[PDB]
Amino acid sequence: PSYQIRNSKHHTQLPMRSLNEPPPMVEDLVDESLFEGLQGYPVDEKLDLLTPPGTATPSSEWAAINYGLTN
Amino acid sequence: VVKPQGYKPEFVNRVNFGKFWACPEGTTDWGSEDKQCLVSQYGPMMWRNKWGWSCPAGSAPNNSDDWNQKCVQGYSMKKLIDGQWRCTDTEIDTGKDWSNSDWFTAQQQCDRGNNKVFTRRMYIDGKWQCPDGTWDTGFTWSDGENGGKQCKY
Amino acid sequence: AGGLSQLVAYGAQDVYLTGNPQITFFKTVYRRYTNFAIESIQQTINGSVGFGNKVSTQISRNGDLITDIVVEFVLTKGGNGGTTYYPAEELLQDVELEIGGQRIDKHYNDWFRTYDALFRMNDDRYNYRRMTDWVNNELVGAQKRFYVPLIFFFNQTPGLALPLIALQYHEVKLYFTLASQVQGVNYNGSSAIAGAAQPTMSVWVDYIFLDTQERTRFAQLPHEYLIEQLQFTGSETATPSATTQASQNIRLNFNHPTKYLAWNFNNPTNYGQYTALANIPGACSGAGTAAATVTTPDYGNTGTYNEQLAVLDSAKIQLNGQDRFATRKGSYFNKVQPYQSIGGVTPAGVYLYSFALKPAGRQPSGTCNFSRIDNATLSLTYKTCSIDATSPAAVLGNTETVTANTATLLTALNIYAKNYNVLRIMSGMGGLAY
Amino acid sequence: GLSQLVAYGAQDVYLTGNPQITFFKTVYRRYTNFAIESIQQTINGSVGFGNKVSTQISRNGDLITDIVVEFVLTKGGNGGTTYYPAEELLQDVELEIGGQRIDKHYNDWFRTYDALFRMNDDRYNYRRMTDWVNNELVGAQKRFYVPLIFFFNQTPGLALPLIALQYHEVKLYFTLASQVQGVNYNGSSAIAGAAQPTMSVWVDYIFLDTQERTRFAQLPHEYLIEQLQFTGSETATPSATTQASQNIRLNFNHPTKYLAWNFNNPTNYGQYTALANIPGACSGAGTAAATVTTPDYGNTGTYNEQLAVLDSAKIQLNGQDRFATRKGSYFNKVQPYQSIGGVTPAGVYLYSFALKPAGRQPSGTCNFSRIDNATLSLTYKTCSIDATSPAAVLGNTETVTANTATLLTALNIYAKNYNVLRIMSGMGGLAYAN
Amino acid sequence: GGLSQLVAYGAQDVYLTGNPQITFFKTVYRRYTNFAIESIQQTINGSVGFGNKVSTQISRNGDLITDIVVEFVLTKGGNGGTTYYPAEELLQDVELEIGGQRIDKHYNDWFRTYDALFRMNDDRYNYRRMTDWVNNELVGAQKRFYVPLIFFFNQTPGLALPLIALQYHEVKLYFTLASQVQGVNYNGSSAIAGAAQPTMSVWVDYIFLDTQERTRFAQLPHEYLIEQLQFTGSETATPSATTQASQNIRLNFNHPTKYLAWNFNNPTNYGQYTALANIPGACSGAGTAAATVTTPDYGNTGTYNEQLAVLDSAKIQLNGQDRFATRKGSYFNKVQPYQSIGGVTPAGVYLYSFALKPAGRQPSGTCNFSRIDNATLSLTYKTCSIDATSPAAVLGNTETVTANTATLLTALNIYAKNYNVLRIMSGMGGLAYA
Amino acid sequence: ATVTTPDYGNTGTYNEQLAVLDSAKIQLNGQDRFATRKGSYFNKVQPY
Amino acid sequence: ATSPAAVLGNTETVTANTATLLTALNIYAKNYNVLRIMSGMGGLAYA
Amino acid sequence: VGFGNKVSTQISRNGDLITDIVVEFVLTKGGNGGTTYYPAEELLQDVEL
């Protein structure tokens, strides 16, 4: 299936830097596999909730939990 | 003072279904390029046709102003199939034939409930083929997670 | 020597752990966030506060977003230590959550008790009890302020804070039903306590104040929140007896992608009693001595982990009559399920079956969409009520398939289901997707 | 109501799509190559009761984290006479980097911190490492381990890069208490023959491989760290005939995560509550020998709020109320419920400015460097309850406490704030002074 | 109010909220592959009974497997206080075989050691409830016990074993049932006449994947970074009344090791890691006239009282070089788990981590013994001079001594938990490293 | 009098004490179409 | 039910012990369909 | 369930198709042999689909 399905990300008991500190990536802001404090949507310029690739908006998660995924 | 806004229709993007593109299932195959899929229940009587606004291909006029919401999402037409003016097997013929209705309700005939982008094939020509009025999408009953059969609007 | 002697010893098997490293542990990057402040503001309670009364509050538009809600109560003891059991929780019979005139959710005192029994733990659970009961051997006439937190989805995390700023035209309300009676406060079993005080109540909402860019954002943009809801029905228990194992086919009248089911059996007379009474320490009023009775609990010790006094022998869930999983013993739902899925300890008489990998989390992790199941059921087999509850030899020395003769008093069955829905806010108004 | 809304007849069918992630197959991150070693430091000065000693942390590894101060003490009396004596012994510890004080903790802070933020078995294990908890008798000898709680002593994420500090030394200065309860003094009475403590300081070092070690050694680094601010003050002591009140200036600076405080009787370490003739509340409590002027040292702490002295409190910023006045039990039970999840002993209070004050990640702060008038306003309970009569205590009201509660004359106010420890060109210090 | 905090904005806020990266007021969710979990019973080959070796084979009912729970039904061969985690004792060991290869193996003692170090609070209590009788049950009582397995795939969804990708390899489990279980079929060395044989069943929780995930598992090669337990038994250099014995134990381990763990024990009494004494809970009948220090209070076999522990101090050598400075046994018992786990470890159980967080799945530093030609654990024992029958002798003793009964702890159990790679390809699976 | 057999000619009554509905709601697709109302709402108010 | 006082003086949430005899529930719905007649024949447009 | 009573059931959509339906009854003899005639058949007075 043509989809970049990543591995699992579980709540780990240790903080970890992604070794890419000069360019702050946006896919690591919501990755719970590294952070341990709190979870929030990444805010873009002018405080706009920028959804990173792979994740989904709450409406898309509701559609995937009720109606179903695709192939 | 801040300028007031009108309908502001919501349109999604067409998706890749494998070797072809088509509009997602909660939406309709509206217009083209800039406005490919309608999401809301009403949309902008797209001008592109043949040229002509009806309304176009998959939606029908309602009695309103604000062109942005003059067509209602989820309809088609009698669409002659073989020798009879039947709706597609997955469509619901409202009964508004044309002659017993006014202009707006006469056009709103087939109620394409749950079948806005794909329908099933019909036993019309004795061969189980794509309905006369739609594009022949390459999927079949054996193919999983793709219940749609040759169809696109 | 020292740490360097380990560090230097890099082999082939270490490539999987440290070769071409992606991360480190020795420098944490912290994420910059928006400005916000949290203020605890008292809400107005309309209606008369008292036992059995219904009161309500409309949450004022003071902050921009809201989360935590705590209902304060001032109660007095109508008897000595041992007469109450989570009385502030018992008093708050139920709470309804309404947004825009639409019912979003509804919790019950028993839910709060079930939820706690199943999902809180360790010192959290203890600290919780300290806010809802008297736990320092207090005596009759003692006065105490209790704090009952609400557990609606927005009361658990900032991530789900309700955007009051985005609800220009819609009010958010809480309706609170106060119990007609609270054990050890205004009634000792069935007996009213003369002179008992009426409760004092206060509703506190912790508000989030945002900075200008984010306040504006919330006020202008549509917002969708994936939320939790509680479904609940009361059922009559197929009460077991001395000569038989009752069984029961319970229709699970639930809808939506359910995260988990939870249930308990209880004696509706005594709040929080999910097990049979017995003359063993902590299992009944006066247990262990001559004055012991197995008609009344030691209220202060109502909860227990002694499964012997529970009534479920076994159970299974079925969807349209097909088994959801193989039949397991009641102790499987009481001990293993929460071990696996929660990590706490669940009191006897309280059961869980999760459809989720992590039922306590925000993120969906497997659900049962009961809106697609024409006939979902719960099949319960009860234990035989043959144990003479007044005789410890019979109570403590018995087998798996039996329980107390007093277990037949657990005539109520409460089945809960927690599921996921979407709360939508647009252009100043909101309510649920379905 | 002329705004635009969406019907959403099939909004969710429209918004679905392919899976993004799978729960059943984990990818582990490849980490850097490092090793951990526990190395003893040399302590300068004579260690003993009341002495001031210090140590310089040797440049043995590259980064440091955990620090444990070991002490060896012998009981000067029987079980029931000591209370966290190794915690009491380390009167204070000061962290100096480059000669600049970075932080400083006090025995009372360790007690407050623990009482407020540790929990469950961690709290118990902590107690095992600082006290005698198995009914040990006079002469019993134990080695105690007092972990330090500086920012780098809690996470590798803030490991202090000694390697990056080539021109600056890092030192710890420790003050040992003149007296330790149940070890060298029983209340005010010295214990003849009591031994002086043995002391040892251990630092756990991180050894880095070449690529990471080099980056630390050469690059500038900014570590987000937590500092303690603290000062003691006189309490507006309450009495039998009155509810004392007090306006306390809060001389704090920096973006503060939270404030914490306690009231205490400076006579007895860790005593944050009143004494009474109820079990555990005083020496001999519950018997004819009970004295409500001396604590049961082994049971000094309690959750019985009836013995606490704060009726209510509020914090004002720039002279204005920051939140509505709440009862002392709010600060003691609810704040911790919401913000920590553990259980806080009576007499210990918290008010957070942060969503999660117990963690490392910033979650909202109060910048006192931008506040002209920060004031803590306290109202005390009336000290009218006769502590020698259990009925008087156990059956009392919300606004009163023990007559012995007037002995809690000292007030300790603590605050934790976020600063930045900057390291560059072999030197370092704080980003901000105030 | 809250606004007064927001306005207090300046230079020191920049590093916390300037250029915000995330907002805590909005949850982000991830679309996860749809799946379901079903509990399916596996059968047992061989006769179930004490001393018998039986086994199962996990069928391919689902695609991936995680949790495995072994159920046992046991009776009490004596009264309360005569058993100690008997279902744990009973399951002497479990061997994990894939394709005929031994992947791993757990031992009853390991389950006890593992629990002692890594479970905690109500997780630990709930666990005890599933393996023992904890509600003062009496002789003849019968209960179903649930003993979860702790193989790498039994701890997290992340390591669900890919039965799906193992077309040609079966996954089997061999379970050895102890010939004797205390308080069930034996009482110390005596058999219990009439004792019942156990009923046993093995339950496996299967994960059902959707079409897309299923396809990937079938077509892609896989590798998992997994845990293994290495274990050998050694004789203890038994200490005595007049001496501190010492011992150099070769650590015959290989692979990247997360941590070492060990204990000393009395082979006769399961879970006994400490000396017996006439102090409450430390021996059968402790504290009274009937006390004996040759038999434990089985129900209270474990204790946090180190005075009864045998080890004085220890160090680990790698190729004859010290790895860290010698630390006291109390350092391994209390500090190590404080730092690395956050729970409380009972006396007689020791831990030394090479990892920052050994309690997690993510590797965080390892000692690769495949690159250490000769690792050694060097142990020093306490002097066994304390007369265990004299409560004062024990309770008032010194750091370097223990009970005369500590010489009964003649066995040493050393464990090492390490990381290997399970490779799956062409329908077959097995480990990457010997 | 027998409370096992009705007075057939007087079977109908307006005495709600003898009715069994405490409350009800119409739920569409799993969610309340209106707030729960008492049985007397459906019996007396709706038709009023 | 055999004691008028018990019936006539009771509360909103209770009823007669004899109310347990009302075990059957009849649920009706009145709706609109379309009956069409043409060319001498007729019937309903929808299910 | 009893004599003269009317009972009913809805068939769940458990499988895909349904065929046979068997109604089980447990009856006892109120007299000796020769007193009954297909009594389980008599008992099921009617069935409506």
Nearest residue in chain D measured CA to CA from E153: D24
Q: Could you tell me the sign of the dihedral formed by the alpha carbons of D59, D61, D62, D67, in that order?
A: negative
Cβ-defined contact of C29 to A65 (cutoff 8 Å):
no
User: Which residues in E235-263 are b (16+ Cβ under 10 Å) and which e?
Assistant: ebbbbeeeebbebebebebbbbbbbbbbb
| Cα separation, H28 vs H17, whole angstroms | 34
CB E109 within 8 A of CB E266: no
Determine contact: G34 vs chain B, CB below 8 A.
yes
- In chain C, what residues touch D5 (CB-CB under 8 Å)? 426-427, 429
Cβ-defined contact of B25 to D10 (cutoff 8 Å):
yes
- In chain E, what residues touch C41 (CB-CB under 8 Å)? 1
Determine contact: D210 vs chain B, CB below 8 A.
no
- In chain A, what residues touch B144 (CB-CB under 8 Å)? 71
| Cα separation, C407 vs C389, whole angstroms | 9
CB D21 within 8 A of CB E33: yes
> Closest Cα partner for C378 from C247, C259, C209?
C247
- Going from the C-alpha of E235 to that of each of D376, E189, E273, E409, the distances in angstroms are 63, 21, 14, 9
Cβ-defined contact of D20 to A66 (cutoff 8 Å):
no
Cβ-defined contact of G12 to F38 (cutoff 8 Å):
yes
The number of C-alpha atoms within 13 Å of D407 and in the hemisphere containing its C-beta is 20
**DSSP secondary structure letter of residue D239:** B
The CA distance from C122 to the nearest CA of chain D, in Å, is: 6
The chains in contact with chain C, meaning 3 or more Cβ pairs closer than 8 Å, are A, D, E, F, H
How was it solved? cryo-EM
Residue C402's beta-bridge partner residues?
C384
Cβ-defined contact of A16 to C27 (cutoff 8 Å):
no
Nearest residue in chain B measured CA to CA from D13: B26
Cβ-defined contact of C33 to D363 (cutoff 8 Å):
yes
Measured from the Cβ of residue H24, the count of other Cβ atoms closer than 10 Å reads 5
Determine contact: D359 vs chain A, CB below 8 A.
yes
Per-residue DSSP letters for C52-115?
T-EEEEE--S-SSEEEEEEEEEEEE-SSSTTS-SSHHHHHEEEEEEEETTEEEEEEEHHHHHHH
| Cα separation, D113 vs D323, whole angstroms | 24
| Phi/psi at C233 (5° precision) | -135, 145
**DSSP secondary structure letter of residue C198:** P
**DSSP secondary structure letter of residue C371:** G
Determine contact: A5 vs chain D, CB below 8 A.
yes
**DSSP secondary structure letter of residue H28:** -
Cβ-defined contact of B40 to D10 (cutoff 8 Å):
no
| Cα separation, C248 vs C253, whole angstroms | 15
- In chain D, what residues touch A36 (CB-CB under 8 Å)? 359, 361
The CA distance from A45 to the nearest CA of chain D, in Å, is: 20
Cβ-defined contact of D33 to C138 (cutoff 8 Å):
no
- In chain A, what residues touch E357 (CB-CB under 8 Å)? 13-14
Chain C interface, best mutation among E9, E19, E22, E25, by max C CB count within 10 A: E25
Cβ-defined contact of A69 to E33 (cutoff 8 Å):
yes
Question: What residues have CB less than 8 Å from C103, skipping those under 6 apart?
Answer: C96, C97, F32, F35
- In chain H, what residues touch C375 (CB-CB under 8 Å)? 10, 12-14
User: Which residues in E55-88 are b (16+ Cβ under 10 Å) and which e?
Assistant: bbebeeebbbbbbbbbbbbbbbbbbbbbbbbbbb
Q: How is residue C115 written in tokens?
A: 């939820």
CB E364 within 8 A of CB E221: no
The chains in contact with chain G, meaning 3 or more Cβ pairs closer than 8 Å, are B, F
Size of chain A, expressed as the number of residues it contains = 71
- In chain D, what residues touch B7 (CB-CB under 8 Å)? 4
Determine contact: E328 vs chain D, CB below 8 A.
yes
- In chain E, what residues touch A42 (CB-CB under 8 Å)? 21-22, 28
- Going from the C-alpha of B88 to that of each of A64, D79, E152, the distances in angstroms are 29, 89, 55
Cβ-defined contact of F29 to C371 (cutoff 8 Å):
yes
Residue D424's beta-bridge partner residues?
D427
- Going from the C-alpha of C234 to that of each of C264, E40, G24, H12, the distances in angstroms are 10, 30, 20, 23
- In chain C, what residues touch F35 (CB-CB under 8 Å)? 103
Helix (H/G/I), strand (E/B), else coil: E100: coil
Cβ-defined contact of D26 to A8 (cutoff 8 Å):
yes
Whether chain E lies against chain C with 3 or more Cβ pairs closer than 8 A is yes
Cβ-defined contact of C126 to D343 (cutoff 8 Å):
yes
Residue C189's beta-bridge partner residues?
none
- Burial bucket for residue D412 (CB in 10 Å: 0-12, 13-18, 19+): buried
Question: What residues have CB less than 8 Å from B134, skipping those under 6 apart?
Answer: B88, B119, B150, B151, B152, B153
| Phi/psi at D283 (5° precision) | -65, 125
Question: What residues have CB less than 8 Å from D46, skipping those under 6 apart?
Answer: D53
Question: What residues have CB less than 8 Å from C44, skipping those under 6 apart?
Answer: C57, C58, C60
The CA distance from G32 to the nearest CA of chain B, in Å, is: 14
Question: What residues have CB less than 8 Å from D184, skipping those under 6 apart?
Answer: D49, D76, D190, D191, D194
**DSSP secondary structure letter of residue C414:** E
Cβ-defined contact of G8 to F17 (cutoff 8 Å):
yes
CB D250 within 8 A of CB D333: no
Cβ-defined contact of E25 to C208 (cutoff 8 Å):
yes
- In chain C, what residues touch D352 (CB-CB under 8 Å)? 38
Determine contact: E157 vs chain A, CB below 8 A.
yes
Instruction: Kindly provide the resolution of this structure in angstroms, with one decimal.
Output: 3.5
Per-residue DSSP letters for E310-363?
-EEEEEEEETTEESS--EEHHIIIIIHHHHHTSS-PPTTEEEEESSS-TTSSS-
| Cα separation, E128 vs E122, whole angstroms | 9
Q: How is residue E338 written in tokens?
A: 């404080």
Whether chain B lies against chain D with 3 or more Cβ pairs closer than 8 A is yes
Cβ-defined contact of E370 to C13 (cutoff 8 Å):
yes
CB C311 within 8 A of CB C383: yes
Determine contact: D12 vs chain B, CB below 8 A.
yes
Measured from the Cβ of residue D29, the count of other Cβ atoms closer than 10 Å reads 20
Cβ-defined contact of E32 to C364 (cutoff 8 Å):
yes
CB C214 within 8 A of CB A47: yes
| Cα separation, C164 vs D98, whole angstroms | 49
| Cα separation, E376 vs D238, whole angstroms | 63
Whether chain G lies against chain F with 3 or more Cβ pairs closer than 8 A is yes
Peptide bond between residue B56 and the one before it cis (omega within 30 degrees of 0) = yes
Of F30, F32, F35, the CB nearest to C371: F30
Determine contact: C428 vs chain A, CB below 8 A.
no
Determine contact: E322 vs chain C, CB below 8 A.
yes
| Cα separation, D158 vs D151, whole angstroms | 7
The H or E element that residue C116 is part of is helix C109-119
Helix (H/G/I), strand (E/B), else coil: C123: helix
| Beta-strand relationship, D255-264 and G35-38 | unpaired
The chains in contact with chain H, meaning 3 or more Cβ pairs closer than 8 Å, are C
The CA distance from D1 to the nearest CA of chain B, in Å, is: 12
Cβ contacts below 8 Å, chain B against chain G, sum to: 3
Determine contact: C191 vs chain D, CB below 8 A.
no
| Cα separation, C173 vs C153, whole angstroms | 15
The number of C-alpha atoms within 13 Å of E153 and in the hemisphere containing its C-beta is 26
| Phi/psi at E211 (5° precision) | -60, -45
- Going from the C-alpha of D202 to that of each of D124, D172, E318, E331, E383, the distances in angstroms are 22, 11, 21, 11, 26
| Cα separation, C349 vs C340, whole angstroms | 18
